[PDB]
């Protein structure tokens, strides 16, 4: 009945020294029934990464919508959209459905190509922006992720250290939520290289 917890799933993002990390689980279900263990929730438009939790039909719809919009942006502007600008576009697009919203929890992550500055942001379903220095969490295990991040996180972590921190934050949060887990993916993002890692986790 509650659209935000029919399918399940989580996204977390963190900043480090000259880097950002964004991660998600792989579960899609119909309440108690696990359906898919390959449902990725992180997408990218150029160098800007977007994670989306919530109702899966809206996750897919919004990916297709922001691909559409960022493609047109690039044709007109003759450059890739930046994280700061993309954040505003997400907010604008969510708020225009104020009274019939997409049941989602989006998370933006990336590095501004000009300034080199690490950037993350989160949103509620109607587009309010939370622009955090440290970390952003989203999904059915958001309480769990908040607890893990708030204790495990320290600022200015190197990319390979930041990988360990975000992975342990995701895995341990997922294991305390019935509707999250079934695999996980972690993106480590630097100014001109991006590494993607699939995590071994418990399959229940």
């Amino acid at each position: 009945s509650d659209p935000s917890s029919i399918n399940g799933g989580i996204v977390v993002a963190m900043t480090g020294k000259d880097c950002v990390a964004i991660a998600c689980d792989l579960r899609l279900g119909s309440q108690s029934l696990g359906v898919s263990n390959k449902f990725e929730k992180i997408f990218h438009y150029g160098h800007v990464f977007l994670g989306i939790t919530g109702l899966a039909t809206d996750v897919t719809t919004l990916n297709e919508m922001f691909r559409y919009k960022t493609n047109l942006y690039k044709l007109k502007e003759e450059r890739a959209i930046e994280p700061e600008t993309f954040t505003q576009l997400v907010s604008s697009s969510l708020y225009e459905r104020r009274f019939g919203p997409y049941f989602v929890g989006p998370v933006v992550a990336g590095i501004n190509s000009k300034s080199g500055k690490p950037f993350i942001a989160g949103f509620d379903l109607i587009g309010c922006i939370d622009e955090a220095k440290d970390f952003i969490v989203s999904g059915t295990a958001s309480d769990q992720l908040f607890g893990m991040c708030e204790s495990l996180y320290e600022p200015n972590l190197e990319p390979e250290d930041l990988f360990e921190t975000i992975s342990q934050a995701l895995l341990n949060a997922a294991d305390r939520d019935a509707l999250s887990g079934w695999g996980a993916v972690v993106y480590i993002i630097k100014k001109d290289e991006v590494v993607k890692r699939y995590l071994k986790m418990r399959q229940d």
Partner: protein, 250 residues
């Protein structure tokens, strides 16, 4: 009490000409001279304040208009047509850009939106084209400084420097000799004042000339402090006194 003009008033003639666009360009030719010059660290736009009466207060009539904090516009042709285009250009900068992306549009895309509005008056039912040519100067982070011309057809072109209206043929030749890619903004203002003196008949001073720049950020003109990223408008209209100072070293 019906608008029955649902058909085009601009059509192709046997020779391939769009008559109303050509005639609009003729109206632009009769209009007062305006120019634009691009420097390395700025852009300047300028025109003559042709006062219709000495009893009229020419300060109230602004030929040079702010569109966004980093974009300005000047024209040659029909003044009322320009005024409504400035209103629409300011609004479309918000509706089709700032309310979506949270930032002001880059010069080229605002130009593109103005161009679109002018094209539509060249094809839609029951309207004539706009009887103006615009010069739009601006700055944005990724494209730097730029200068664009927009014609009654909706067509637009980027310029290093140009002129439009009355004495544009002579003024463009003058600019070809003086312009180089190493010009500072002060040098471009000096060249703008020299070029404009040729097309003006009567008085030549800060009260009869209207000049604005797209230059450095002006934090003193912002009106508030406390946000490091907001550094102020790059558009600045030069005062009557500031113009007269440069006319002594002329």
């Amino acid at each position: 009490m019906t608008d029955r003009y649902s058909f085009s008033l601009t059509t192709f003639s046997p020779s391939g000409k769009l008559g109303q666009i050509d005639y609009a360009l003729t109206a632009v030719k009769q209009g007062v001279t305006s120019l634009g010059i691009k420097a390395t660290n700025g852009v300047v736009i300028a025109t003559e304040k042709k006062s219709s009466s000495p009893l009229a207060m020419s300060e109230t009539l602004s030929k040079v208009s702010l569109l966004t904090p980093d974009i300005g516009a000047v024209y040659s042709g029909m003044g009322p047509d320009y005024r409504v285009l400035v209103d629409k250009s300011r609004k479309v900068a918000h509706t089709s850009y700032k309310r979506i992306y949270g930032e002001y549009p880059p010069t080229k895309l605002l130009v593109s939106e103005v161009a679109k509005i002018m094209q539509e008056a060249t094809q839609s039912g029951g309207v004539r084209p706009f009887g103006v040519s615009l010069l739009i100067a601006g700055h944005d982070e990724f494209n730097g400084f730029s200068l664009y011309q927009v014609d009654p057809s909706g067509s637009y072109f980027p310029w290093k420097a140009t002129a439009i209206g009355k004495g544009s043929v002579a003024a463009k030749t003058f600019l070809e000799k003086r312009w180089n890619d190493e010009l500072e903004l002060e040098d471009a203002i000096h060249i703008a004042l020299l070029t404009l003196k040729e097309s003006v008949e009567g008085e030549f001073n800060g009260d009869t000339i209207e000049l604005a720049i797209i230059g450095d950020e002006n934090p003193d003109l912002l009106g508030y402090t406390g946000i490091p990223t907001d550094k102020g408008p790059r558009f600045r209209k030069l005062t009557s006194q500031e113009i007269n100072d440069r006319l002594e070293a002329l």
